[PDB]
Amino acid sequence: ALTQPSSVSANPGETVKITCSGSTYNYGWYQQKSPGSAPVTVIYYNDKRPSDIPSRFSGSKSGSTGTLTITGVQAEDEAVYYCGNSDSRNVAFGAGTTLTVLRTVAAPSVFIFPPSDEQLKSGTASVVCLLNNFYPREAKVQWKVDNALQSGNSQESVTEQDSKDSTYSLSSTLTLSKADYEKHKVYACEVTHQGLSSPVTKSFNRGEC
Amino acid sequence: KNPVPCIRDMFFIYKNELYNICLNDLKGEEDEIHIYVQKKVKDSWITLNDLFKETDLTGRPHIFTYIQEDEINILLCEDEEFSNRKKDLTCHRFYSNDGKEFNNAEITI
C-alpha cells in the first residue's frame, strides 16, 4: 500500500519533507485543513504545482518514493496531507500525514457554562467546559459533580490548529437529566495541561449568581 | 503457476527455444488483462511472466517483439484512438538476456 508517516512536526521557517512510498509511478499531494472539507491539490504529477499554490510547495520522486517538500513552512500550512498514486494497478491514497506547527507552550483559558433555563425546562441539563487557545494539544479534562468523578456521560470536541497562532480550542460537554442535575450543587471541570503548574478548576453552584 | 486460459500468438524463437505471447482477455467481473510469455518445454507451454502486471496501463496495449544483441525485447505501447490520438505515445520495454527473467524500462515516443 501507499505508506506515509502518521504525523510530522516542524517549527516555522523549517524545511518539511513528507514522503510516500509504494509506487514507482506518478505521485500527487492533496491538502485538507478540516475533516470533511474540500481538499486542495498542492502537487500533482510528481512535481507540478498549480498556479494558486505558494512557491514553497514542491514535489519530487526517486525510485518508488514520492517526496513532498515545504521549504520554510508557515503557520497557515497546518493540515493533513494525502498522497495519491497507483498501488499495484489499484487507484489508492495514503493514510494521510498531519502537519503540526511547533509553538511555545500556551496555557488554556478555561470557562464553564451552566445549563440554560430554556433547556432545563425540557428535561435535560448540559454543562459545557471550554478550553481556549492552548498548546500542545494534550490536555486532561475531568468532570466532578459534588467532588465525585463522572465517567461515561461526557463528550469533548477539539478544533483544528489555528492558522495564525497555532493554538487549539477544546470543549467538554457534560449531560445529565434535570432530576439528577437538581440533586447536586457544585459542578466543576478541572483541567490538566503542560502550561498549568497545577490543575485549574472552574466551578459554579446551582442556583447562585 | 496456474495461468488463466488465453490465446497463443506472436510465436518467436530464442536460443533454439519456441516462445509465445499468451493474450488473456475474456470479459467479466473476475478476469483482468493478462499478457503472458510462455516457452515450449517438452510437450507443454510453461508460463514465465505476466507482462501487463508490470505496467500502469488500463487498456489493451500494442505488442512488439524483436531480437537484438542476443536479447529479447517485448514492447507494450498504449493503444491510442485514431480520432483521440495524443502527440506523445508511451511504451514499456521488457528486455532479457537469458530467456527466464525480464526487467522494465519505461520509454516514451
Added chain:
Amino acid sequence: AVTLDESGGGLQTPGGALSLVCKASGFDFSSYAMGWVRQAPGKGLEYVAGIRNDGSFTLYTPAVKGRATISRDNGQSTVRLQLNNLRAEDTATYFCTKSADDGGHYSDFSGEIDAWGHGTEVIVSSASTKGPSVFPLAPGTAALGCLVKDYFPEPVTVSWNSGALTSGVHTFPAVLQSSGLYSLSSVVTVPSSSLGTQTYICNVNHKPSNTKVDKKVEPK
C-alpha cells in the same frame, strides 16, 4: 477557471440508492478523466470510482463492487455516480475530481488530480430529519457561547451577528451523541466591558430541515 459543482447527496434509506452529479466547466471535458473521492466520518480519503476521458474504462473501489456505476456526458460536461444497496459504511462526503491525463494509466486518477469540487454529503440512515435546539452559553475578557443540540443530519452553519462578529469565534466540530443526534457548540471571546451594552445574537441554519434560528445570548 475550472469549477466542479456537486449535488445529489443527503439522507438516504439503507438498502436504497442515490445519485450524485458533477457539473464541470472551464476545461475541455472530453480530454481528461474524472472520478469521485469520498471520506467517511473520522476516516481518510478513499477513491470511489473513475472513468476514462471517453468512458471505455471504469474502475471502482472494492467496497462498492456490484453497486456503483460511473458515467459521463462529454457534451454536457457532467459526470455522475450511482450507488445501490446502501450501507452505513457509505456515509461520507463525496468529492468530484478531475485528472490531468486521459485515464490510460492508473496513476492518472489519484496521482494527477489537478482539480477538486466542494463536496457533497451522503448520510445512509434509517432516521428522519430534525432541526436543532439552540441554548445560550451565558457568561479582563469574557467568553459567551451558543449550544446547538439534537439535529440530524449534520450540515449546519453558525454565524455571529449575521456575520459582523468573526474574530475570536470558535465553532467546534460536531459530535454524534448516543441518541443518533449531532450536537455542536460555538463560542466567542469578547471584551467584558461590552457585555450588556452590545447585543450578541447566535445565527444558526440547518438546511435539511429548513430551520433558521436567531438566538440572543445574555447573562442572567
